[PDB]
Short mmCIF file of C-alpha atoms in Angstrom, two decimals:
data_model
loop_
_atom_site.label_atom_id
_atom_site.label_comp_id
_atom_site.label_asym_id
_atom_site.label_seq_id
_atom_site.Cartn_x
_atom_site.Cartn_y
_atom_site.Cartn_z
CA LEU W 23 96.70 73.28 128.76
CA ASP W 24 96.01 75.42 125.68
CA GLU W 25 92.33 75.87 124.79
CA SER W 26 90.77 76.77 121.45
CA UNK W 27 88.66 79.70 120.28
CA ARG R 30 113.79 99.36 103.58
CA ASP R 31 113.49 102.65 101.68
CA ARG R 32 110.56 104.99 102.36
CA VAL R 33 109.31 105.95 98.86
CA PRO R 34 106.95 109.14 98.84
CA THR R 35 103.57 108.80 97.17
CA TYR R 36 103.48 105.17 98.11
CA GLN R 37 102.70 105.70 101.80
CA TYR R 38 99.52 106.56 103.66
CA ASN R 39 99.71 110.16 104.84
CA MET R 40 100.30 110.06 108.62
CA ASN R 41 100.46 113.80 109.14
CA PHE R 42 97.30 114.32 111.19
CA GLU R 43 96.52 115.80 114.60
CA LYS R 44 96.23 112.23 115.85
CA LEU R 45 96.85 108.64 114.73
CA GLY R 46 93.33 107.45 115.42
CA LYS R 47 90.88 105.51 117.55
CA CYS R 48 91.46 101.91 118.68
CA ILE R 49 88.38 99.90 119.67
CA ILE R 50 89.02 96.67 121.61
CA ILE R 51 86.18 94.19 122.17
CA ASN R 52 87.27 91.82 124.94
CA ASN R 53 84.69 89.01 125.12
CA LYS R 54 85.41 86.63 127.99
CA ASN R 55 82.04 85.42 129.31
CA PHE R 56 79.14 83.94 127.33
CA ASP R 57 75.50 82.99 128.02
CA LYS R 58 75.10 79.27 128.76
CA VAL R 59 72.72 78.86 125.80
CA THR R 60 75.46 79.49 123.23
CA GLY R 61 77.36 76.50 124.56
CA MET R 62 80.55 78.60 124.68
CA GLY R 63 82.94 78.50 127.61
CA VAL R 64 84.86 81.19 129.46
CA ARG R 65 87.87 82.38 127.48
CA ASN R 66 90.56 82.39 130.14
CA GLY R 67 93.65 84.34 129.14
CA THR R 68 91.66 86.97 127.26
CA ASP R 69 92.21 89.66 129.91
CA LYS R 70 95.93 89.03 129.46
CA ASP R 71 95.59 89.78 125.74
CA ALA R 72 93.37 92.84 126.20
CA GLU R 73 95.78 94.33 128.71
CA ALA R 74 98.74 93.60 126.42
CA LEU R 75 96.97 94.99 123.36
CA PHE R 76 95.82 98.15 125.13
CA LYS R 77 99.28 98.99 126.48
CA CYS R 78 100.67 98.13 123.07
CA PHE R 79 98.38 100.34 120.95
CA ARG R 80 98.43 103.26 123.41
CA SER R 81 102.20 103.20 122.97
CA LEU R 82 101.73 103.39 119.20
CA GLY R 83 99.73 106.61 119.47
CA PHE R 84 96.11 105.39 119.25
CA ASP R 85 93.30 106.53 121.59
CA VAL R 86 92.37 103.11 123.01
CA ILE R 87 88.95 102.08 124.33
CA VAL R 88 88.27 98.66 125.88
CA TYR R 89 84.79 97.12 125.95
CA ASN R 90 84.07 93.88 127.85
CA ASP R 91 81.61 90.94 127.54
CA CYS R 92 79.52 92.54 124.73
CA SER R 93 76.22 91.28 123.37
CA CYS R 94 75.81 91.06 119.60
CA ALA R 95 73.66 94.20 119.52
CA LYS R 96 76.23 96.07 121.60
CA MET R 97 79.05 95.17 119.22
CA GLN R 98 76.93 96.26 116.23
CA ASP R 99 75.84 99.55 117.74
CA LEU R 100 79.23 100.33 119.23
CA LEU R 101 80.94 99.95 115.82
CA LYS R 102 78.17 101.77 113.94
CA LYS R 103 78.59 104.74 116.29
CA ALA R 104 82.35 104.81 115.80
CA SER R 105 81.86 105.01 112.03
CA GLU R 106 79.58 108.02 112.48
CA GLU R 107 82.05 110.02 114.55
CA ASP R 108 84.29 112.55 112.79
CA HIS R 109 87.64 111.04 111.80
CA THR R 110 88.75 114.04 109.74
CA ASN R 111 91.74 114.62 112.02
CA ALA R 112 92.76 110.96 112.38
CA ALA R 113 95.34 109.09 110.26
CA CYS R 114 93.60 105.71 110.46
CA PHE R 115 91.28 103.51 112.50
CA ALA R 116 91.77 100.21 114.34
CA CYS R 117 89.54 97.55 115.84
CA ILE R 118 90.51 94.37 117.67
CA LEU R 119 88.05 91.55 118.32
CA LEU R 120 88.77 88.89 120.97
CA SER R 121 86.12 86.21 121.17
CA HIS R 122 84.75 82.85 120.04
CA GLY R 123 83.94 82.29 116.39
CA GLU R 124 83.14 80.09 113.42
CA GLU R 125 83.76 80.72 109.71
CA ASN R 126 82.79 84.35 108.93
CA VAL R 127 81.23 84.78 112.34
CA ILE R 128 82.23 86.23 115.72
CA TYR R 129 80.50 85.55 119.04
CA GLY R 130 78.86 88.10 121.27
CA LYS R 131 77.82 86.89 124.70
CA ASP R 132 74.38 86.83 123.06
CA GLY R 133 75.14 84.54 120.11
CA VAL R 134 76.81 85.07 116.71
CA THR R 135 77.06 87.96 114.24
CA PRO R 136 78.77 88.15 110.77
CA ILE R 137 82.23 89.76 110.71
CA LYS R 138 81.29 91.48 107.45
CA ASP R 139 78.37 93.33 109.04
CA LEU R 140 80.65 94.66 111.78
CA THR R 141 83.23 96.01 109.32
CA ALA R 142 80.74 97.19 106.69
CA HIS R 143 80.03 100.28 108.80
CA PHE R 144 83.43 101.57 107.65
CA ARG R 145 83.11 101.13 103.88
CA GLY R 146 84.03 104.23 101.90
CA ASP R 147 80.44 105.24 101.28
CA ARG R 148 79.33 104.78 104.90
CA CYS R 149 82.18 106.44 106.75
CA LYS R 150 83.43 109.30 104.62
CA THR R 151 85.86 110.77 107.16
CA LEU R 152 87.96 107.58 107.03
CA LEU R 153 87.96 107.51 103.23
CA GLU R 154 91.43 106.91 101.72
CA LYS R 155 92.61 106.08 105.24
CA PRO R 156 93.64 102.59 106.40
CA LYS R 157 90.99 100.68 108.41
CA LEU R 158 92.54 97.86 110.47
CA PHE R 159 90.84 94.85 112.04
CA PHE R 160 92.72 92.24 114.07
CA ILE R 161 90.60 89.17 114.84
CA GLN R 162 91.42 86.56 117.49
CA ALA R 163 88.72 83.92 117.10
CA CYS R 164 88.23 80.45 115.63
CA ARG R 165 87.19 80.15 112.02
CA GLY R 166 86.09 76.54 111.98
CA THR R 167 87.08 73.23 113.56
CA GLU R 168 89.95 71.92 111.43
CA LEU R 169 93.26 71.15 113.20
CA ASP R 170 96.72 71.84 111.76
CA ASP R 171 98.89 68.82 112.59
CA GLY R 172 102.08 70.19 111.06
CA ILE R 173 104.91 68.53 109.15
CA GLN R 174 108.62 67.68 109.35
CA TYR A 1 87.64 110.43 90.35
CA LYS A 2 86.14 107.61 92.45
CA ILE A 3 87.38 105.07 95.02
CA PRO A 4 86.13 101.52 95.67
CA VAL A 5 83.99 101.28 98.81
CA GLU A 6 85.85 98.13 99.89
CA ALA A 7 89.32 99.70 99.61
CA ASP A 8 91.79 100.47 102.40
CA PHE A 9 90.69 97.61 104.64
CA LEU A 10 93.16 95.24 106.28
CA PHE A 11 92.10 92.15 108.22
CA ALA A 12 94.63 90.33 110.38
CA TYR A 13 92.96 87.03 111.34
CA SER A 14 94.71 84.88 113.97
CA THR A 15 94.20 81.79 111.83
CA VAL A 16 93.36 80.62 108.30
CA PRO A 17 89.74 79.90 107.17
CA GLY A 18 88.15 76.78 108.62
CA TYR A 19 90.66 76.21 111.44
CA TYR A 20 90.98 76.57 115.20
CA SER A 21 92.82 79.37 116.97
CA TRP A 22 94.83 78.58 120.09
CA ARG A 23 94.80 80.46 123.38
CA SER A 24 96.88 79.84 126.50
CA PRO A 25 94.95 80.40 129.79
CA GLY A 26 98.08 81.74 131.44
CA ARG A 27 99.74 83.69 128.63
CA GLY A 28 96.88 84.52 126.27
CA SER A 29 96.26 83.70 122.61
CA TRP A 30 99.34 82.88 120.52
CA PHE A 31 98.48 85.45 117.88
CA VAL A 32 98.03 88.33 120.35
CA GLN A 33 101.20 87.41 122.25
CA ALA A 34 103.22 87.40 119.04
CA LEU A 35 101.62 90.57 117.70
CA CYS A 36 102.30 92.61 120.86
CA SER A 37 105.80 91.14 121.07
CA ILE A 38 106.72 92.30 117.58
CA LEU A 39 104.82 95.61 117.80
CA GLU A 40 106.75 96.55 120.95
CA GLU A 41 109.97 95.79 119.10
CA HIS A 42 109.19 97.13 115.61
CA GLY A 43 105.87 98.96 115.49
CA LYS A 44 107.58 102.32 115.13
CA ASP A 45 109.81 101.37 112.20
CA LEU A 46 108.36 98.52 110.16
CA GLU A 47 105.70 98.58 107.46
CA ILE A 48 102.45 96.96 108.61
CA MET A 49 102.90 94.00 106.21
CA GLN A 50 106.45 93.34 107.45
CA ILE A 51 105.12 93.34 110.98
CA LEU A 52 102.34 90.87 110.23
CA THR A 53 104.61 88.62 108.17
CA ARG A 54 106.91 88.41 111.20
CA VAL A 55 103.88 87.68 113.38
CA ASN A 56 103.00 84.97 110.90
CA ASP A 57 106.43 83.44 111.27
CA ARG A 58 106.42 83.63 115.06
CA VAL A 59 103.07 81.91 115.55
CA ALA A 60 104.02 79.27 112.97
CA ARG A 61 107.37 78.43 114.55
CA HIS A 62 107.40 79.24 118.29
CA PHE A 63 104.02 77.65 119.18
CA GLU A 64 102.74 74.09 119.53
CA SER A 65 99.55 73.11 121.39
CA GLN A 66 99.76 70.88 124.44
CA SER A 67 96.76 68.91 125.71
CA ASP A 68 95.89 65.76 127.68
CA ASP A 69 93.63 64.73 124.79
CA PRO A 70 95.59 62.98 121.99
CA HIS A 71 93.26 64.49 119.38
CA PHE A 72 94.31 68.07 120.20
CA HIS A 73 97.96 67.31 120.98
CA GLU A 74 100.94 69.03 119.32
CA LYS A 75 98.93 70.99 116.74
CA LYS A 76 100.02 74.12 114.86
CA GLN A 77 98.62 77.49 113.78
CA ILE A 78 99.22 80.01 110.99
CA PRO A 79 97.70 83.52 110.90
CA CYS A 80 96.02 84.91 107.80
CA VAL A 81 96.40 88.48 106.51
CA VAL A 82 93.89 89.96 104.05
CA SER A 83 94.85 93.27 102.46
CA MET A 84 92.88 95.80 100.45
CA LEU A 85 95.35 98.53 101.34
CA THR A 86 96.52 100.78 98.50
CA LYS A 87 99.63 102.23 100.15
CA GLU A 88 102.42 101.17 102.50
CA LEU A 89 101.56 101.72 106.17
CA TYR A 90 103.90 103.10 108.85
CA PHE A 91 102.80 104.18 112.32
CA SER A 92 105.23 107.09 112.58
CA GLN A 93 106.44 110.42 111.11
CA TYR T 3 109.99 70.22 115.33
CA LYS T 4 107.10 71.50 113.06
CA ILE T 5 105.70 73.89 110.53
CA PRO T 6 101.97 74.48 109.75
CA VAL T 7 100.70 72.73 106.62
CA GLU T 8 98.81 75.85 105.51
CA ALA T 9 101.83 78.14 105.86
CA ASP T 10 103.72 79.95 103.08
CA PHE T 11 100.77 80.28 100.70
CA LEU T 12 99.87 83.58 99.02
CA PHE T 13 96.65 84.29 97.14
CA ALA T 14 96.33 87.40 95.03
CA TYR T 15 92.69 87.68 93.91
CA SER T 16 91.54 90.21 91.33
CA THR T 17 88.65 91.18 93.60
CA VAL T 18 87.20 90.99 97.12
CA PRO T 19 84.78 88.18 98.13
CA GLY T 20 81.30 88.44 96.64
CA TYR T 21 82.13 90.96 93.93
CA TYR T 22 82.42 91.13 90.16
CA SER T 23 85.79 91.26 88.43
CA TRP T 24 86.18 93.40 85.32
CA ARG T 25 87.82 92.66 81.98
CA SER T 26 88.18 94.75 78.82
CA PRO T 27 87.87 92.72 75.55
CA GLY T 28 90.51 94.89 73.90
CA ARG T 29 93.04 95.31 76.71
CA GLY T 30 92.37 92.44 79.09
CA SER T 31 91.21 92.29 82.70
CA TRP T 32 92.05 95.21 85.00
CA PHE T 33 93.89 93.05 87.53
CA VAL T 34 96.26 91.46 85.00
CA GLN T 35 96.85 94.77 83.22
CA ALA T 36 97.97 96.43 86.48
CA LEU T 37 99.87 93.39 87.71
CA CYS T 38 101.93 93.21 84.54
CA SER T 39 102.73 96.92 84.38
CA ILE T 40 103.94 96.94 88.00
CA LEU T 41 105.91 93.71 87.60
CA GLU T 42 107.47 94.87 84.36
CA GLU T 43 108.89 97.89 86.17
CA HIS T 44 109.48 96.73 89.76
CA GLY T 45 109.39 92.93 89.72
CA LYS T 46 113.10 92.56 90.37
CA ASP T 47 113.40 95.26 93.05
CA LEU T 48 110.35 95.21 95.33
CA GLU T 49 109.06 92.83 98.00
CA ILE T 50 105.94 91.02 96.75
CA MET T 51 103.59 92.70 99.27
CA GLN T 52 104.84 96.09 98.06
CA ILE T 53 104.14 95.06 94.46
CA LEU T 54 100.63 93.73 95.10
CA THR T 55 99.92 96.82 97.17
CA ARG T 56 100.74 99.07 94.23
CA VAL T 57 98.61 96.80 92.03
CA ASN T 58 95.75 97.40 94.48
CA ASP T 59 96.21 101.17 94.14
CA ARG T 60 96.39 101.07 90.33
CA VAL T 61 93.27 98.92 89.95
CA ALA T 62 91.34 101.06 92.46
CA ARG T 63 92.32 104.38 90.90
CA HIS T 64 93.05 103.91 87.20
CA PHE T 65 89.85 101.97 86.33
CA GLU T 66 86.08 102.49 86.06
CA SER T 67 83.77 100.14 84.13
CA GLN T 68 82.03 101.39 81.00
CA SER T 69 78.76 99.80 79.92
CA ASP T 70 75.46 100.75 78.28
CA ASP T 71 73.34 99.09 80.95
CA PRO T 72 73.00 101.93 83.51
CA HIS T 73 73.24 99.25 86.20
CA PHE T 74 76.82 98.36 85.22
CA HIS T 75 77.86 101.92 84.44
CA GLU T 76 80.94 103.44 86.10
CA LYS T 77 81.66 100.65 88.59
CA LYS T 78 84.88 100.24 90.60
CA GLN T 79 87.06 97.30 91.66
CA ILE T 80 89.55 96.51 94.44
CA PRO T 81 91.85 93.45 94.46
CA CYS T 82 92.31 91.23 97.49
CA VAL T 83 95.58 89.80 98.81
CA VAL T 84 95.54 86.88 101.24
CA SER T 85 98.95 86.14 102.75
CA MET T 86 100.15 83.21 104.86
CA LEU T 87 103.76 83.96 104.00
CA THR T 88 106.32 83.85 106.82
CA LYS T 89 109.14 85.82 105.19
CA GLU T 90 109.60 88.73 102.78
CA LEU T 91 109.68 87.66 99.13
CA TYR T 92 111.96 89.12 96.45
CA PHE T 93 112.33 87.70 92.94
CA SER T 94 116.10 88.17 92.67
CA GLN T 95 119.68 87.59 93.85
CA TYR B 11 113.57 87.69 107.25
CA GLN B 12 113.63 86.90 103.52
CA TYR B 13 112.86 83.69 101.66
CA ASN B 14 116.04 82.08 100.32
CA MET B 15 116.17 82.51 96.53
CA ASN B 16 119.54 80.85 96.10
CA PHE B 17 118.43 77.87 93.96
CA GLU B 18 119.07 76.81 90.38
CA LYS B 19 115.48 77.45 89.31
CA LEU B 20 113.14 80.21 90.43
CA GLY B 21 110.28 77.79 89.92
CA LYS B 22 107.54 76.44 87.72
CA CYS B 23 104.68 78.74 86.75
CA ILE B 24 101.42 77.22 85.60
CA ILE B 25 99.05 79.51 83.73
CA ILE B 26 95.54 78.19 83.10
CA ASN B 27 93.78 80.31 80.48
CA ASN B 28 90.10 79.36 80.11
CA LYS B 29 88.36 81.30 77.32
CA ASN B 30 85.68 79.15 75.64
CA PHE B 31 83.16 77.22 77.74
CA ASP B 32 80.78 74.32 77.17
CA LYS B 33 77.32 75.57 76.24
CA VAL B 34 75.80 73.76 79.23
CA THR B 35 77.73 75.90 81.74
CA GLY B 36 76.02 78.94 80.25
CA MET B 37 79.18 81.07 80.37
CA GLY B 38 80.26 83.34 77.53
CA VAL B 39 83.61 83.73 75.78
CA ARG B 40 86.17 85.53 77.94
CA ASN B 41 87.48 87.97 75.33
CA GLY B 42 90.75 89.71 76.04
CA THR B 43 91.89 86.80 78.18
CA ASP B 44 94.45 85.87 75.54
CA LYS B 45 95.98 89.32 75.81
CA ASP B 46 96.20 88.80 79.56
CA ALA B 47 97.75 85.35 79.14
CA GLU B 48 100.46 86.55 76.76
CA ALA B 49 101.19 89.52 79.02
CA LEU B 50 101.45 87.27 82.06
CA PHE B 51 103.63 84.88 80.10
CA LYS B 52 106.28 87.49 79.34
CA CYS B 53 106.29 88.93 82.87
CA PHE B 54 106.69 85.73 84.80
CA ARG B 55 109.22 84.59 82.22
CA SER B 56 111.28 87.76 82.96
CA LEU B 57 111.10 87.14 86.68
CA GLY B 58 112.68 83.78 85.89
CA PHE B 59 109.77 81.31 86.04
CA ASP B 60 109.49 78.27 83.77
CA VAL B 61 106.05 79.09 82.41
CA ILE B 62 103.57 76.86 80.59
CA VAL B 63 100.09 77.92 79.46
CA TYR B 64 97.21 75.41 79.28
CA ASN B 65 94.06 76.46 77.40
CA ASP B 66 90.32 75.74 77.86
CA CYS B 67 90.91 73.16 80.57
CA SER B 68 88.17 70.97 82.01
CA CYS B 69 87.85 70.69 85.77
CA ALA B 70 89.52 67.26 85.72
CA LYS B 71 92.32 68.74 83.62
CA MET B 72 92.89 71.65 86.00
CA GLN B 73 92.75 69.19 88.89
CA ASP B 74 95.18 66.73 87.30
CA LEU B 75 97.42 69.60 86.20
CA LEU B 76 97.84 70.98 89.73
CA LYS B 77 98.12 67.52 91.27
CA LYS B 78 100.95 66.48 88.96
CA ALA B 79 102.83 69.73 89.54
CA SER B 80 102.71 69.05 93.27
CA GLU B 81 104.15 65.58 92.74
CA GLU B 82 107.08 66.89 90.70
CA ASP B 83 110.38 67.39 92.53
CA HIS B 84 111.00 71.03 93.51
CA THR B 85 114.23 70.45 95.42
CA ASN B 86 115.97 72.97 93.17
CA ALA B 87 113.19 75.56 92.94
CA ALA B 88 112.95 78.69 95.09
CA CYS B 89 109.17 78.70 94.79
CA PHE B 90 106.07 77.86 92.78
CA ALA B 91 103.45 80.05 91.07
CA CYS B 92 100.05 79.34 89.53
CA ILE B 93 97.77 81.73 87.64
CA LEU B 94 94.11 80.94 87.04
CA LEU B 95 92.24 83.10 84.50
CA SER B 96 88.56 82.24 84.06
CA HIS B 97 84.92 82.68 85.06
CA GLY B 98 84.20 82.10 88.71
CA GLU B 99 82.07 82.47 91.79
CA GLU B 100 82.48 82.58 95.56
CA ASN B 101 85.10 79.93 96.42
CA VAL B 102 85.06 78.29 93.00
CA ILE B 103 86.42 78.70 89.49
CA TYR B 104 85.09 77.47 86.15
CA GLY B 105 86.61 74.76 83.99
CA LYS B 106 85.31 74.67 80.42
CA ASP B 107 82.81 72.03 81.63
CA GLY B 108 81.65 73.36 85.00
CA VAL B 109 82.89 74.58 88.39
CA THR B 110 85.55 73.27 90.76
CA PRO B 111 86.60 74.40 94.29
CA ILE B 112 89.68 76.61 94.44
CA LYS B 113 90.58 74.92 97.71
CA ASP B 114 90.96 71.54 95.98
CA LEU B 115 93.42 73.00 93.48
CA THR B 116 95.70 74.52 96.11
CA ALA B 117 95.51 71.87 98.86
CA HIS B 118 97.79 69.63 96.78
CA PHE B 119 100.56 72.02 97.84
CA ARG B 120 100.07 71.84 101.60
CA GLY B 121 103.35 71.13 103.37
CA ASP B 122 102.21 67.63 104.23
CA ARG B 123 101.52 66.89 100.54
CA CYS B 124 104.51 68.39 98.74
CA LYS B 125 107.66 68.09 100.83
CA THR B 126 109.76 69.74 98.11
CA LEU B 127 107.92 73.04 98.51
CA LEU B 128 108.00 73.12 102.30
CA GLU B 129 109.10 76.49 103.71
CA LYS B 130 109.04 77.80 100.14
CA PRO B 131 106.41 80.27 98.90
CA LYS B 132 103.40 79.00 96.95
CA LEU B 133 101.78 81.76 94.87
CA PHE B 134 98.30 81.75 93.35
CA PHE B 135 96.96 84.65 91.27
CA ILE B 136 93.26 84.38 90.43
CA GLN B 137 91.42 86.49 87.84
CA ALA B 138 87.78 85.51 88.25
CA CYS B 139 84.52 86.76 89.76
CA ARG B 140 83.74 85.92 93.38
CA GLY B 141 80.09 86.88 93.45
CA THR B 142 77.67 89.36 91.91
CA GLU B 143 78.03 92.48 94.06
CA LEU B 144 79.07 95.75 92.41
CA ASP B 145 81.20 98.55 93.83
CA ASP B 146 79.67 101.96 93.11
CA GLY B 147 82.71 103.94 94.25
CA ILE B 148 82.56 107.18 96.21
CA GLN B 149 83.23 110.95 95.93
CA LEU X 13 82.42 97.63 76.66
CA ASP X 14 83.73 96.06 79.87
CA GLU X 15 82.62 92.49 80.68
CA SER X 16 82.59 90.63 84.01
CA UNK X 17 84.33 87.42 85.18
#
């Protein structure tokens, strides 16, 4: 699952 | 389209230029930031990509805020007289106007200021590029249609 | 005879002010993926602004965040280019 | 299915963040002067980023503030273009 | 790779020309701004925009102006353009009666708030200060 | 004399 910066 | 003359940056130099890549993956627990998995994939891709373009690429990893500051200040003091332009790529965590070092946070402006015309005269009239991969706040774009 | 000290700077941010930037653990950040993709294909023959506009379009269209959490599910991203350049930029010739 | 809500916006500021923006009482602001001269001659044939780039060059080169106060004497200015566009923009055909 | 310009109208162009300000704001008269406005009027007209110039607007006026424009139907427009000429500071612009956030003026055009301008360019040209730093130039 | 905005 995509993660955020 | 058409390549009009006096409207293009002069690329006729011994070399295209330097390409600094700051690949920040790990951070001190006290910043509350997590590991940025997938960042090595980007750094590798970017490096191969810019080398191909003609830049002299350098990759730095897990830098502290002081390291990032010093590293960039030193690049702006080198002689760029024979380079067509300069490039820097930052991969890390961030908040509005700020980028994370493993240490904590530092202002983007202070990192790039080292290359203003008056502080880095060998890059004067030459394009100075900065690609930033970091968050700039916490708002989410839900989309439409 | 003079030149502004802030001139000839170009900032390609992966996202607009105040927002999140998405990164895939297996493929990497959306912005970097897209950028490299297009640079490999057109870096030697497109102006820098054409390249970034196309990167803008690719991140905007091709990507959509997937997460178990409903709050961060199916969200989008749009890069942000800030130019102070005074000429057109080509990486060749 | 989607498109980012912040996409396709373009901001052309007369100056970079945190700086002054100059205007001549007899001829108007530097930014508008340059923007109109470029548009009047290339508005129908150049992509908008090309146009605003030339406006950046004109404002950076052709101008230099003139004031009595030695603190505001011979100052320079550089416009700032923020683009979220996803395609090239031409004002014709 | 190019925005589609095949529409009946190029688009609406709103020009807000603030020159005189309320004494309380402490801002002086923006001389030469009328010359800019007229110049901008002819240019955008030539491009093909349906231009309208509003003078000395208050913050509510500027706000209402941009809001209404976003609620109009742009199904036949290729794009939209807005020009703000006035006094300003970091992130804000002056109305004749004070300051208002530039973000608030443009947000009305976000894709999820103006379906008729989705996938169409939204242009904003701003002539205003953004701080008090000076550029000394070099060489 | 140039003025600022």
